[PDB]
Design a protein around this ligand. Structure first.
Ligand SMILES: CCC(=O)N1CC[C@H](Nc2ncnc3c2CN(c2cnc(OC)c(C(F)(F)F)c2)CC3)C1
Length: 794
């Protein structure tokens, strides 16, 4: 029985569980047994949760950051529906008391034993929030009458049931023979002792073949708990390989004897993995002699607690106790000023960190960076992050996963936190899965991520099968995309499109591609695949256009996905999460710049999905075709928004244009052309290919857009300066939360994105957001760039 659950886990995570045993690793084996028990205890809690408490797990609420509304409601397993007049300020129990009052009237034959399901979707409307606050009821108002289904307590409960399962003064010292080296020239081995991005002593090098055979300025007593010994083999300068090791193991014991380090290819790297290269055969190895001291374990918290300019740093350390009292948020500045190469100074800091008050989510997000590698500093950060909302945790989930790459040991406070929250929310567990599964091709992350997904599956027997279905569809889509890629080069598009449909109509494909949850959004059910409306896009990697159509949801079941294999979808995903954050921060301060942060999620090696924005078209397609090319875009909105509807559309356009003009400027999105800018029939303007960001520069205002803002008029200052305001207001909101973007962008350095690697890339975001300058000084600097963008258009 357990052999099947294990076979499914191996297929789902794309790594056999037998591979973990073959390592015969006490660290990997201890993680597996400990985390399985943690997840099983979490899974146990869910099978006893109340019916409203389960709805909270499986279908978390989607909420936005007086007036009337017509809504059709219908009880489960009944054709008969009822349209009722409800207020936007009315709570779901009022709709449920109206639906129950109508039911008793018609059927001749308590609303608190019910929940409203967004018909044909895995989204629910529960809790004491007015109908205006729900993402669905709110979106319908701007779109469409909301279609709801009265799901009873017994129907929600039948789901959970079905979803069941030590101080030596001697100077520190290390080098035997290093096998499998490819070079011309002499080989040297440089070695530095790091505690994050900072050094603990001088970088001692080795003496200047394919199999070459061959003292640190810090004491063995002074070595911090999280000390790294970083190596680099090079030719004497052409780099060859690098390797990192923790001087203390997971059981907190000082490393002794021989160690064979399987090095990673280059062209000292502190941020790199402390674990070796998996290609034992290919990788160049460096055998080192980690010296004897005796066993020596690191002092426990009980025994440990018992113990800016150059001159400015000395002042921060003197007033360290005053920093805990007067400036607790200044913890980061104090930790940096602490000397981690002095056990006496590093112990005094822990005595202050242990009595230190909890920090806000923003201050905790900085402490998660590689500049802060201490376990107690790390545990403090996660302890402060425990106050995160499930919706807030989701907004930063991508960045927290990247920080798992900075982790020194497999069992860590972050893995526990991320897994604990994942098992508490099916939406957080869904996305954590795909953030981990999409990096299984990467050899460095492959073990950590594999073991985390296995543990989640140990505590999600049903969700494992849900994700397996998603994973089965994505396999058929790679196989189908490969056909489209081969065939496209041989025949006419209608011939390839017809060939794709025949392939899709196969039993194997129809079964796989249908009745699954969207990997981009678990609440969107990709039901019946519309083979006739499916095709492929003309871009280099021939992306797939896969249309779906649910009957139970009507128009809401008509959804589409884009499968793209060949290119990196990470930066596009990062940019869209940053635009969604912008839209949230804007809405929080009453500014809805009607944004379209469409779904984009990487699922594999150069493989991922993109949500289809229905009823949209590229600016290039509209402009290709009006007596004047400038009038094409306005005449287009006139076609889709006739009569009194045009006025709403020009406003929708302006708002979205302002938001995207700021977003593309701030994020530094270059390569802007008519083909990677889209418009929705509602008037909403959005951007699509985010291949390049952070100036890889100035504010850009297009004349074809400035014309739509001006209501088609040559001179229209009322409407154009109203737009200038939206840009100013939106840019100043982001500036206040600039520290939030800088912290998340700092954590994303772990992703290994070519366009986000150095400190110069983060400087672009400091400059665009004019971080140093005062609000007045920064609003003027933007007013110069904006006015210059206006002159730049003819
Ligand atoms: C089969 C109809 C057709 O060829 N179209 C072309 C223009 C238009 N494109 C879209 N229409 C509606 N929604 C979207 C799109 C295009 N989107 C999209 C966004 N990033 C991407 O890559 C990073 C890609 C892709 F190149 F990989 F495919 C597509 C966003 C969603 C429809």
């Amino acid at each position: 029985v357990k052999k099947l659950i294990n076979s499914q886990i191996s297929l789902l995570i794309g790594k056999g569980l037998h591979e973990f045993d073959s390592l015969r690793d006490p660290e990997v084996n201890d993680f597996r047994t400990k985390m399985r028990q943690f997840c099983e205890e979490a899974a146990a809690h869910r099978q006893q949760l109340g019916w409203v408490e389960w709805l909270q797990y499986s279908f978390p609420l989607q909420l936005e950051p007086n007036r009337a509304l017509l809504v059709n409601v219908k009880f489960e397993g009944s054709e008969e529906s009822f349209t009722f007049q409800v207020s936007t300020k009315d709570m779901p129990l009022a709709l449920m008391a109206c639906a129950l009052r109508k039911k008793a009237t018609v059927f001749r034959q308590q609303p608190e034993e019910y929940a409203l399901q967004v018909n044909g979707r895995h989204e629910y409307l529960y809790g004491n929030y007015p109908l205006c606050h729900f993402q669905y009821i709110c979106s319908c108002l701007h779109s469409l009458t909301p279609h709801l289904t009265m799901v009873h307590s017994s129907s929600i409960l039948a789901m959970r049931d079905e979803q069941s399962n030590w101080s030596l003064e001697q100077p520190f010292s290390i080098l035997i023979e290093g096998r499998k080296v490819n070079a011309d020239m002499k080989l040297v081995v440089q070695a530095g002792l790091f505690h994050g991005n900072e050094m603990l002593c001088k970088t001692v090098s080795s003496s200047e073949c394919s199999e070459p055979v061959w003292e640190f300025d810090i004491s063995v007593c002074d070595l911090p708990r999280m000390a790294r010994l970083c190596f680099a083999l090079y030719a004497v300068d052409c780099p060859i390989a690098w390797a990192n090791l923790m001087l203390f193991d997971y059981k907190d014991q000082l490393k002794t004897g021989e160690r064979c380090l399987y090095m990673w290819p280059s062209v000292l790297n502190p941020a790199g993995t402390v674990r070796g290269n998996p290609n034992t055969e290919s990788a160049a190895a460096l055998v080192i002699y980690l010296p004897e001291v005796a066993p020596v374990y690191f002092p426990a918290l009980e025994k440990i607690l018992e113990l800016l300019y150059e001159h400015e740093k000395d002042l921060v350390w003197k007033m360290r106790h005053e920093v805990q009292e007067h400036f607790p948020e200044a913890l980061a500045r104090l930790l940096l000023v602490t000397k981690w190469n002095k056990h006496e100074d590093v112990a005094q800091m822990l005595y202050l960190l242990c009595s230190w008050p909890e920090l806000p989510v923003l201050s905790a997000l900085e402490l998660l960076d590689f500049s802060f590698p201490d376990c107690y500093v790390g545990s403090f950060a996660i302890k402060s992050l425990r106050k995160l909302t499930d919706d807030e945790l989701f907004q930063y989930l991508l960045q927290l996963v990247q920080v798992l790459k900075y982790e020194s040991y497999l069992d860590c406070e972050l893995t526990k936190f991320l897994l604990g929250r994942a098992l508490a929310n099916r939406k957080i567990g869904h996305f954590l899965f795909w953030h981990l599964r999409s990096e299984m091709h990467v050899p460095s992350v492959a073990l950590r991520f594999g073991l985390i997904m296995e543990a989640y599956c140990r505590g999600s027997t049903h969700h494992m099968k849900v994700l397996m279905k998603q994973g089965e569809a994505l396999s058929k889509l790679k196989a189908l995309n490969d056909f489209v890629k081969v065939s496209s080069q041989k025949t006419t598009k209608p011939q390839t499109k017809e060939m794709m449909h025949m392939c899709m109509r196969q039993e194997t494909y129809m079964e796989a591609l249908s009745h699954l949850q969207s990997p981009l959004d678990p609440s969107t059910l990709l039901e019946e695949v519309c083979v006739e409306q499916c095709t492929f896009m003309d871009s280099k990697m021939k992306p797939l256009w896969i249309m779906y159509s649910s009957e139970e949801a009507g128009s809401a079941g008509n959804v589409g996905i884009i499968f793209k294999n060949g290119d990196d979808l990470r930066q596009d995903m990062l940019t869209l999460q940053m635009i969604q954050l912008m839209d949230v921060l804007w809405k929080q301060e009453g500014l809805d710049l009607r944004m379209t942060p469409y779904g984009c999620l990487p699922t594999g090696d150069r493989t991922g999905l993109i949500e289809v924005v229905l009823h949209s078209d590229t600016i290039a397609n509209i402009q290709l075709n009006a007596a004047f090319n400038k009038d094409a875009l306005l005449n287009w909105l006139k076609s889709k928004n006739p009569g009194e509807a045009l006025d709403r559309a020009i406003e929708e356009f302006t708002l979205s244009c302002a938001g995207y003009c700021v977003a593309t400027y701030v994020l530094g999105i270059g390569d802007r052309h008519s083909d990677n800018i889209m418009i929705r029939e509602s008037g909403q303007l959005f951007h699509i290919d985010f291949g390049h960001f952070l100036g890889n520069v100035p504010f850009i205002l297009t004349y074809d857009f400035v014309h739509v803002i001006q209501q088609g008029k040559t001179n229209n200052s009322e409407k154009f300066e109203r737009f200038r305001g939206y840009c100013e207001r939106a840019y100043t909101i982001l500036r206040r939360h600039g520290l939030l973007f800088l912290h998340l962008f700092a954590l994303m350095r772990a992703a290994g994105l070519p366009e986000l690697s150095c400190s110069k890339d983060i400087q672009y975001l400091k400059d665009s957001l004019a971080l140093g300058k005062t609000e007045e000084e920064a609003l003027k600097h933007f007013r110069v760039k904006f006015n210059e963008a206006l002159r730049e258009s003819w």
